[PDB]
Amino acid sequence: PVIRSKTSARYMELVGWLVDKGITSEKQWIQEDQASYISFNAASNSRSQIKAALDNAGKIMSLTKTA
Amino acid sequence: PGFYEIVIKVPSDLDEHLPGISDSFVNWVAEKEWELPPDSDMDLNLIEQAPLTVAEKLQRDFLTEWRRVSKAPEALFFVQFEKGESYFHMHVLVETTGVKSMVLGRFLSQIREKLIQRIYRGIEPTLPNWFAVTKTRNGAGGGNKVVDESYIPNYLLPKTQPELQWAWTNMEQYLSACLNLTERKRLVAQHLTHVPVIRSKTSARYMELVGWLVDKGITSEKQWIQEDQASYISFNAASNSRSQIKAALDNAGKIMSLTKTAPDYLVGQQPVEDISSNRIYKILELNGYDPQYAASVFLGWATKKFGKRNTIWLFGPATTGKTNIAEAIAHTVPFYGCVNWTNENFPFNDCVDKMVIWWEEGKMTAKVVESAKAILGGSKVRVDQKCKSSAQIDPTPVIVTSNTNMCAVIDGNSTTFEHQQPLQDRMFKFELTRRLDHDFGKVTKQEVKDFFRWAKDHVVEVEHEFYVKKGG
Amino acid sequence: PGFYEIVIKVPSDLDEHLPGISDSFVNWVAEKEWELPPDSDMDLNLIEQAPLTVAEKLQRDFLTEWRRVSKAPEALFFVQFEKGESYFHMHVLVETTGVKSMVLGRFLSQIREKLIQRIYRGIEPTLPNWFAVTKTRNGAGGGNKVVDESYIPNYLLPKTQPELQWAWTNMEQYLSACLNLTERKRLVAQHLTPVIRSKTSARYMELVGWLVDKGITSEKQWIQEDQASYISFNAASNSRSQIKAALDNAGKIMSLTKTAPDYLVGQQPVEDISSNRIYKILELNGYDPQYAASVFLGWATKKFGKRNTIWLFGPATTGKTNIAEAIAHTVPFYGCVNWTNENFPFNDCVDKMVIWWEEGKMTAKVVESAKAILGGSKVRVDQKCKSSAQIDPTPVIVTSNTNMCAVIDGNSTTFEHQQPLQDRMFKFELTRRLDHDFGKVTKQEVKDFFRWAKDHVVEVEHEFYVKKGG
Amino acid sequence: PGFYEIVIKVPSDLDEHLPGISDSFVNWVAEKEWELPPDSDMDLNLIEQAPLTVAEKLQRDFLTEWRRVSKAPEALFFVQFEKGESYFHMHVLVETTGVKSMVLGRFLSQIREKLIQRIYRGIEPTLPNWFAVTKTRNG
Amino acid sequence: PVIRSKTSARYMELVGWLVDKGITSEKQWIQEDQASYISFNAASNSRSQIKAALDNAGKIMSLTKTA
Question: From the CB coordinates, do chains C and A have 3 or more pairs under 8 Å?
Fold first, then answer.
């Protein structure tokens, strides 16, 4: 299935925009744009979301795409 | 433009929901037959008849009352008659033009009363909350849910023939998708293919606080109180505000770890009007060195302008116009670290995750001479740590303030001089032999800031050499 | 000088937009040919012929009528004949000289009627809104838009062949940019080149302020000053989620801001120093109380640096602990260095203003950090079950009876770090024992001693042995 | 001493707000000019012309009608013409002496009728409530 | 400063009754009035409040009263 909501669509768009630039960890986020980083880090549920997004992007890049 | 999701339950059982209804109403509702348009692939057998007419009358009266009470006949709307699992309802949508959130409650009650007095003719439906508006939270807590245009293709259009019955809307972008599954599916697919930040009153202030903190140079709780104790206390009243302090501190640290150059924080803002009063000026003029040339050399060394020769070495006994300036610089910069010359295995243990490498009364070691030459010659290298993993040390301006000849690189229980020329061709020799008086006073951070700023107001041609020109 | 943006649609299809037009007009529209200037890179094939004549006549008559209704023949203008996606239009621009913004509709209608009666000969174009003025807001609620000279190179000049057909203007700076893409692009490239208010936070701020004013060190003093407040703030659902935070915040605020000398300075002057217990202890032992008082004044005010430490050496029960017992009770916060714990000896000394060392014994595990702490130098040390913390230069006092220079290292001792420690303290020789009727030192006695010290300042010489009493 | 906050929305477009206006009015509004007084440092280029004359005529007739209906020509007042982003609005203030809050509405209606029958020459501006008084609550 | 609320007043009355009746442990509460003990031991949050009030009463009696 593909549940949708106001909190999941933003996360989907964020991960889709991140995987395009090849984000590795939080270090690359500040290099690209710290404004968007602090925007999401301002919330309280983003701490547990960024850690999962990093691993998800890593696992995706390694299984689908090739160097 | 936002919209309000109004829920209007369509009475399914006219005998139970509308006890005592006149027979004329039921006759007129049952005699009205409907037929889908010619270009409509929807199956009419699944769609009802009397409930369809009831929903049509209800939504028509609702739209009429809304246009009459809001004075906005050109307002957009989107009605969709569906069939719930146990009762019929409608996902009515009306724009917020001319109707604020603090007046919607009264208009809803007025429209409900008008519908009960006109359609049902006084008889009020006995359904659990037959007329209400979607809220951001269940109960009387959350407020009116002001959805967006993306809510239509995200919940209404995805529904197909089984749950769909009819729909009415004046928007030009959802005209053919009223009674056509193909158009609805096409719009849903287009919306999914089309699809970042979030705007909130609680995050907007945090985004400015994190930017003001880095501007003021705060990297801990003491620095926050140094500016204003009341301001710091205001941002730590509740647990949510307390965790915010730690989050902001961590983010500010990780950001400062990736600025662009150290001088970005050391260089002052406003110019200098009296440099003679600065202690650095007197320290440089007493040892026999042109303050202007020394300031230019310091600016070029801190800005990574020399590259290979981007290093300064203050010679002469300890505390001779060498230790005071270095201590002031270390106290001014956010983080610092003293090179542990005693620990030849991991002398850079204290210089981990630091912006400046300070060598206070310490001799050069041969165990980290090759790796240190890379950072001194403008090159990156990942050195080890004391019981910790390695870490890349980007080209950072190193400052040496020792008394013994640094060329005598020690290699354990002996001494060598093979690294004399290699280390001398990438450092500046500052023969600061003059000793400061007991009443000289320690240099402050504002003094270092003013010195670094004046270094920019009076720039001179800095020559890449070993021996720095003295004050003639 | 501003300009008015008046849109004028050019009827393309003369049969549909101008029904009933005479054949003579169509003949003139189709016969009049046009040709770009010699220095024009635009393609004439893409530019239509019939609409160009109509646009030229329209703009000419419009300028002629404007120069008459405004009384400004030398006014600047800028016309650009373009081609929309489904209808032709012109971005006519006229200066605001002569004609105002409020009295514009009348002149516009008059010019439209004249243009009709002249070119179209009574027949009015059937194009929806074929003659109007660009408003400041999309709708029936906005005044006439008054653009500026910068509006041309930021909207009209960027446009290209698929859009443009012709343009007319008298400005010396925009003549070559009317029928030339190179000049248009050149001009386009040259012109472009926290606090928070809340009822739940105000109470917390007021509580922090009251605690800082009264000076609540630990939780015990809270109940002493007020019990109802501690009961109310503890009755909350979170219980003890804010009490400890407020205590730590107040402690840190009072430590970083104020210091011990702020309170050690006595208020009123000393009336009799001989009656003080510290003075008697210092005099009976054969040491000039004046130098000791000056040393204490300079030590709290961290004015010695390396030698910013006192070492009251002597046998036990010789007026050594009696002074520290009062010095620690007078100051707000106090601690004790645990010499037995070689790993974390500074377990109790956490954010304290005065560090008292009772029967201290230097160890090899903290011989480096000790030299920096006692010597008035910033240094970071690892805390017990807590992160590291920098102990800023703080007055430290020792009251041991053994040799502090002896560095213990398990089942042995080394005197390598003897001179560094000897050159950073003030050794004493207090051998006289105090009687039972001497009594302990009070809190006011320390303040009186500090006041007498400030009242009698002498040169403090960096000597190992303190000057004895002559 | 209190004052009544009166607001007058000057027609931003006479052709759209005042349909059928006489030609003499437009001619007088266009041909009329003004200059900066001696003790004035405001740029005349930024200040409009026709709106200035319109506001002057409006405030003059309003003050005359108020002094005639109140029988207090020596009363205080304060008129200030503004230039809004969407439309032009005037801020008129009159003393609350000799005029109660009840008869204030009747006097306002009377002067409005006089203005629409004399100034506008029987033309009602299309702007919503072109003339009214500010209340203590938006509504 | 003092927070005002029903729970605050209830806790104040509780600690007052405790320090008046000389209660210092859970045994004395049952010895005097075993009904209030079971009444306050129902809610989960009240269990921590009981210990907090006990400690507060003990400290208050140690600071004010003497041996």
Answer: no
